[PDB]
Paper text:
BPSL1038 is a protein with 88 amino acids encoded by a gene annotated as hypothetical in B. pseudomallei. The overall structure folded into a modified βαββαβα ferredoxin fold similar to known Cas2 nucleases.
The structure of each rBPSL1038 protomer adopted a modified βαββαβα ferredoxin fold. The long β4 strand (residues 61–71) contains a kink at residue T67 that results in a sharp curved shape. One end of the β4 strand (residues 61–67) from one protomer forms an anti-parallel β-sheet with the end of the β4 strand (residues 68–71) of the other protomer, assembling the dimerization backbone of the BPSL1038 dimer. Overall, protomer A has a well-ordered fusion 6xHis-tag (13 amino acids) at the N-terminal region with residues -11 to -8 forming an additional β1 strand. Both subunits (residues 1–87) are highly similar with an r.m.s.d of 1.3 Å over 87 Cα atoms (residues 1–87); the biggest deviation was observed at loop L4 and helix α3 regions and is likely due to the existence of the fusion His-tag β1 strand that interacts with the β4 strand of protomer A. In BPSL1038, the aspartate (D11) pair is 5.9 Å apart and located together with the S32, S33 and T34 residues at the β2-β3 turn that forms a negatively charged cage for coordinating a water molecule that is tetrahedrally hydrogen bonded to residues S33 and T34 from both subunits. Further structure analysis revealed that the rather flat and wide potential substrate-binding surface of BPSL1038 provides a suitable platform for dsDNA binding. The side chains of four BPSL1038 solvent-exposed positively charged amino acids (R10, R30, R54 and K57) from each subunit are systematically oriented on the potential substrate binding surface, with the negatively charged cage formed by the D11SST motif located in the middle.
Residue numbers in the entry:
A (entry chain A): -13 to 87
B (entry chain B): 2 to 87
């Protein structure tokens, strides 16, 4: 099996808030530095996209990011209700089930 | 429609962008590896379609989104999100 899906359900250790944060390529490593502050509650999906499981209002997170990276920074923050995904990295698969629930 | 965010790894960015063109003005590219799509499509169907076309071993994430907040220099993204999301 390499296809998976989660309804990102707030049950037990899985927090209520499910966020996908996207920046432009130019700002990739700056956003990564910031995202690492959320510890095991985030994962980097690509150079410019992260998933974060945190109970934070998206507008509040946006203000927090803009205060740190600059008010003219591009960012998109989505609240997600599901995820459907594929990988062949057996180790990333395990991180992901637990992170997604 | 449904509101989807599609993410791929950096190594597949060109292939994904070519695929995403089929969705016309209903998609916008957010970064080299992320798109927004406003489309009535079942995420597993979209996944099967991408894997049949880009390769079965391809990493991909498709999220269903319920809200977006953004600040952007990309006029096409701003317009697409503000008009289509809801
Ligand atoms: Na097809």
């Amino acid at each position: 099996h390499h296809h998976h899906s989660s309804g990102l359900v707030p049950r037990g250790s899985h927090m209520a808030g499910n966020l996908v944060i996207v920046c432009r390529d130019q700002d990739a490593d700056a956003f990564d530095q910031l995202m690492q502050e959320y510890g095991s509650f985030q994962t980097r999906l690509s150079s410019t996209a992260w998933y974060l499981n945190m109970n934070i209002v998206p507008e509040t997170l946006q203000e927090d990011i803009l205060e740190r990276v600059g008010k003219y920074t591009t960012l998109y923050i989505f609240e997600a209700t599901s995820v459907t995904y594929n990988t062949i990295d057996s180790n990333a698969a395990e991180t992901l089930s637990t992170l997604f629930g």
